[PDB]
């Protein structure tokens, strides 16, 4: 679990979003298991504008944050799950590190600030769902 809070917005994992998230959309795309919803309390969390390849990711199934070397935002299969069906997940960006089932929300930072979130995991290579190219979200 986990999300971004910056400004009036909070992002989450879109297969992990609330009732509360869902009555209070602003956007969501299942491509790139995205949902942001609206909150009244201002966010203060620095979101990257960068093309970093490298960062920190909080790891909660180890309670520890991991340094990684990450690939460029790109479309990529996702397996099945209780969520999806077998599908192309995009803006999605690879490393190889740990991750289970739980630790998807955990924050990916760069010397610039936030560069996304996880999103999927399994062989030893942990993915983040990019949220660098959301502009709108400083607005
Ligand atoms: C989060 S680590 C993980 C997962 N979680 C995922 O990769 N998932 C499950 C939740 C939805 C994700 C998505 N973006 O479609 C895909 C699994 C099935 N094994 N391991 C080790
Ligand atoms: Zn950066």
Same mark, same amino acid.
């Given at each position: 679990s986990g999300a971004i809070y910056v400004g009036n917005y909070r992002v989450v994992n879109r297969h992990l @979003?609330?009732?509360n998230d869902w009555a209070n &959309? *602003?956007?969501?795309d299942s491509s790139r298991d995205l &949902? *942001? =919803?609206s909150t009244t309390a201002q966010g203060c969390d620095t979101i990257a504008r960068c093309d970093c390849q490298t960062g920190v990711y909080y790891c909660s199934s180890r309670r520890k944050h991991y340094p990684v070397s990450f690939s460029k935002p790109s479309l990529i299969f996702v397996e099945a =799950?209780?969520?999806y069906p077998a599908r192309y997940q995009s803006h999605l960006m690879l490393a190889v590190?740990? =991750?289970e089932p739980g630790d998807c929300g955990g924050i990916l930072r760069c010397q610039h600030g936030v560069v996304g979130i996880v999103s999927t995991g399994g062989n030893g290579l942990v993915?983040? @769902?990019?949220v660098r190219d959301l502009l709108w979200l400083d607005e």
């Open positions: @979003a609330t009732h &959309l *602003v956007w969501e &949902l *942001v =919803s =799950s209780e969520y590190g740990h =991750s993915g983040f @769902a990019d």
